[PDB]
Amino acid sequence: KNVLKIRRRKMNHHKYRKLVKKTRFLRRKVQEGRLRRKQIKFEKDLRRIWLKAGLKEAPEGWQTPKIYLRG
Amino acid sequence: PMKGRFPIRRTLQYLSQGNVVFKDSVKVMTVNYNTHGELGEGARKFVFFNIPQIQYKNPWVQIMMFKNMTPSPFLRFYLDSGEQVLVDVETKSNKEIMEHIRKILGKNEETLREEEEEKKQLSHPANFGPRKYCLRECICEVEGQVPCPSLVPLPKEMRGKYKAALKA
Amino acid sequence: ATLNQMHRLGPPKRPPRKLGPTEGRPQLKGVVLCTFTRKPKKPNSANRKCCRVRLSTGREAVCFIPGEGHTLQEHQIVLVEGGRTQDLPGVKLTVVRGKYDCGHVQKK
Amino acid sequence: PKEKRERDSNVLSVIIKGDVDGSVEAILNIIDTYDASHECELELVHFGVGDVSANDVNLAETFDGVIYGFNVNAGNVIQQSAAKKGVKIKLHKIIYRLVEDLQEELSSRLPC
RNA sequence: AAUAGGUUUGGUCCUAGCCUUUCUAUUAGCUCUUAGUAAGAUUACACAUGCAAGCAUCCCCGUUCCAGUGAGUUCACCCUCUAAAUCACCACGAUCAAAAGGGACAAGCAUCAAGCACGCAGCAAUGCAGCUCAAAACGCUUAGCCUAGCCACACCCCCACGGGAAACAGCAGUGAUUAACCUUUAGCAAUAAACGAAAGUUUAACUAAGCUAUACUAACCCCAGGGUUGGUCAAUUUCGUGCCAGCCACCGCGGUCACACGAUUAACCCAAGUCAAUAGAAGCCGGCGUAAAGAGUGUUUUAGAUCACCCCCUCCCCAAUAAAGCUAAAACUCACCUGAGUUGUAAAAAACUCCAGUUGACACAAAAUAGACUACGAAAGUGGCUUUAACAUAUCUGAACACACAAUAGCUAAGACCCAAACUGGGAUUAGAUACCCCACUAUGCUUAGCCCUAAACCUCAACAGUUAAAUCAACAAAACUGCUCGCCAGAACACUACGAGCCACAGCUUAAAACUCAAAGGACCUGGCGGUGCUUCAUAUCCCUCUAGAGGAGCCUGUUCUGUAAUCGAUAAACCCCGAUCAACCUCACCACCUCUUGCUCAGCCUAUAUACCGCCAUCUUCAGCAAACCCUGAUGAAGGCUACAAAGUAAGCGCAAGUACCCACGUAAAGACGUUAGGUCAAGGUGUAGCCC
RNA sequence: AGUAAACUGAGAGUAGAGUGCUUAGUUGAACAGGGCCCUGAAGCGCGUACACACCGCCCGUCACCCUCCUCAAGUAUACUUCAAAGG
């Protein structure tokens, strides 16, 4: 068989990898912002739980951890 | 072609050929059979060929199968009264098992004929209505009666458009 | 697939059909914004009279004007139907001649 | 050249809505006495009789026009929709008032 | 999708999407005679006016029904128990049917995978920590439904004390809105409902009418229109237009002879309709070596299978894996003694000369021969030596919801360093050379400890059992299948992408769409061409090295191109260029300027256009030997192919070559040289089709 | 090979006109052996995404134009949920 299908995929992947290199600083700023919102969306999900159960504050001694940071 | 061996088993015609219609007492039928052994061959063919027909004719009877739990194959029926009927099936062919359970727990041909007739009383021929329920929709379909105006226009004298015109 | 797999997957699920340029409707009302000509794709050559019109739904689309000669102008009302222009890539709407402000083609 | 071209700043698109048909014809004859097309152009998008409607707001948003009502009303739903779409409904009750306001919008378009 | 059809290509076969033909409904265009019947806002947007519930000796009863709408949406069905209601009254029951309890009950998305209290026991107190869920919980989105009818809603806040606010989703009607558009009719005579003991009363329920080609039925002396006419697919004459104007469901048509455009003529189909758009109807038992597809690997549970039992012939051993130790060859480094060079390659330069050769000492690198063996491991991988531990499963299948692995490259930390080596630097090459070639050197390859989790991880061929029986069999590849199971696939492209989620990953990996676009993409072939394509044999004025005389430089002669002129044309790579011309001072002549003639040397004329309409006559491969009728056979009866002489499917008229003939031979030179190739040359030899000119 | 080379005559066509063309003759060579490196031919293969056929096809960067989609700062708007509760 010919490699014409492989060649189409080859160029797509080449151009994609090159695009990412050209924009790796913008994508890094965007990814950070998404992780911040992802953390906020997670904290809201937990707050909904204790609030719908009748509690007014989080369970005594509970601190919502940061589960999306690189650390 | 239809997948699997004996695809005839997966046809409505085959499933409607079951002759075992359990009496209302029968609530649960457990089938204990062995996958191997020459004396458990009828029970394997019974599960393979006839359990589908039995369930088809008795949709509300629970049928549960158990493999290789005991040394010999047997059927056990649980009745609503609380009585249990143990049927030993070792050495018996699949056709003999179907004929056995029909005799001891199946409705006879007479009891089934009656049920079918009571169902015919539900569709009275003299009733008029939709074709789904009745033979005829309107009396106009009966020859000799005044036909529907959609097919044969009524005389002007039998129509209100002209009865009021003359009267008015 | 096996019978067990066919049972587990169930009947095949058709995708909800794709609504075309009319959004599953026979015709749409539109307001003409501008008129122009669009060249057909190879091997055809011509100046096909087209127009951009905002539809009653609020989507601006390019519409082909059939017939020899038209007098459509900005602010005018037209009725558009389906039927793609085969040689005009992206042209999926056609103005109905003889409805609203678009009149019938003048004979010869 | 871009198939869709930008309307120049000195172009006033107006929607005329009136209470009665004779009132609308009067305003349309006044719009036919416009002779300063060189400095600014007056376009009549749509004219009709009756209260301001969603189509008038949609036509005004499409052509960035101004709706002029003559002895007609605009409801809160129509007025709120115009705010979101940026359309300016200008309800009047006197014909010399509606012409003075028409001239004020034309003056704004004119170059300084 | 069917009795199927069209469309991928130069052609064939396969696969595949798209479309065509059938039947409905809505809407638009154009058109329309009558009668009967049926059906009849786009919209849970806002509504002027009128009417739609009264009855009756006062109480009660009814207005909780009918009628409407489809916003929301598993309250509709079955069983159990059991109110209200009907049988005047109890029915000691039946009928009907709520609430409650139990069960069943739409579609799409798993990129919604966890829900977060969703359970149980106990008289209670209270105790236990459970309950649902990849066999789809929870969640988002969509939709009235299972139509003698049913469900839900009744302006909104699910509800309706309260609030917003002032309600046609009752009939008729209206504004807005949509492609979508029925009368502001009559009567309670019939039936149904409410009320009355009843005669009766009321009822926009309903009945009888009004409007409308949306449908069906029937009919008419007069009265037919819509679409189509390249193929699919029934059916075109004359003109106009000249890739323009336009047409097209698909394939396509139009660039000066259009059955495809516009008009016109005729025909075709249906017909008071026609048929443009839109929507629906018509699609899971087929596949996964190469077309999409066996997920890189192995192992569960709940389950499924009959291949489990009897009942069995290769256990075990060769390069599994982990750990520690070990070293034969070759390097590197150093020392002595010699040499002046070494290195590099098509050829050089640069580089090195503490360089090279001999000898000795010499490793955290890598493992000739064996190996023509074909073993081990789940796969990835594993081929120097020794030892140690050591290679799951006495049915099979089985986790993308898990666990443990996974070449190479890569990341982090600490070490080793012979050699190789991205990057980089220099040299060379080149139009350029960010390459290929040369030199130097780093990351890296190695060890240790963590990561990363990807391969054309492909033997692109799933595990287990069985068959060689046939209907073997699209093609190719690695023959064709059966049983069973899991996984996966459904036109191309977008897309090894976006978003979501997970992850020691942060320019990452896994999972993985849609919109716009196209009518194909694709797999395997046939024939030919072409190859800086292989081997072999050759070229005989000839491919190279050779041989002789020239051209290219000078002048002139002559042709051409350019420039020039009021002032031809044609040829114009080989295959034009002293060529048509074996020939232009006038003439020739076809050109240019000026002047003149108009049935004209001609039963006119035209060297006007078109050699891409042609005959005629030729160039070119040809300094070739092949073309082709008619048959036959092969390929499963595909495009195609058809030779073996100790022969194996070819036979072949004819044409060309050949043979003959001309010239001085049988030699040589001529002549001859098919079919085709270059729409090659020539409308200006002559003739001539088509178009044009005719003071 | 009587070839190349050199030399001479004639003819066609003109009224005349060529350093041109056609044609007759005279004198009269050198090399011809190696090679498959270069360019081709034949035979037998191989490859092929070409098929008016390598003067074939073909990939990417860099405009105008048209279509759709995604990311996104700040901000606004609308919708959804609450009482399925507590005193």
Ligand code: FES
């Ligand atoms: S259906 Fe019977 S009268 Fe019409």
Ligand SMILES: [K+]
């Ligand atoms: K064309």
Ligand SMILES: [K+]
């Ligand atoms: K097809």
Ligand SMILES: [K+]
């Ligand atoms: K009463």
Ligand SMILES: [K+]
């Ligand atoms: K609904």
Ligand SMILES: [K+]
């Ligand atoms: K409601």
Ligand SMILES: [K+]
């Ligand atoms: K009545």
Ligand SMILES: [K+]
């Ligand atoms: K046609």
Ligand SMILES: [K+]
């Ligand atoms: K893979």
Ligand SMILES: [K+]
């Ligand atoms: K070795």
Ligand SMILES: [K+]
């Ligand atoms: K492979």
Ligand SMILES: [K+]
């Ligand atoms: K070939």
Ligand SMILES: [K+]
């Ligand atoms: K010369």
Ligand SMILES: [K+]
């Ligand atoms: K010719």
Ligand SMILES: [K+]
């Ligand atoms: K000629």
Ligand SMILES: [K+]
């Ligand atoms: K001619």
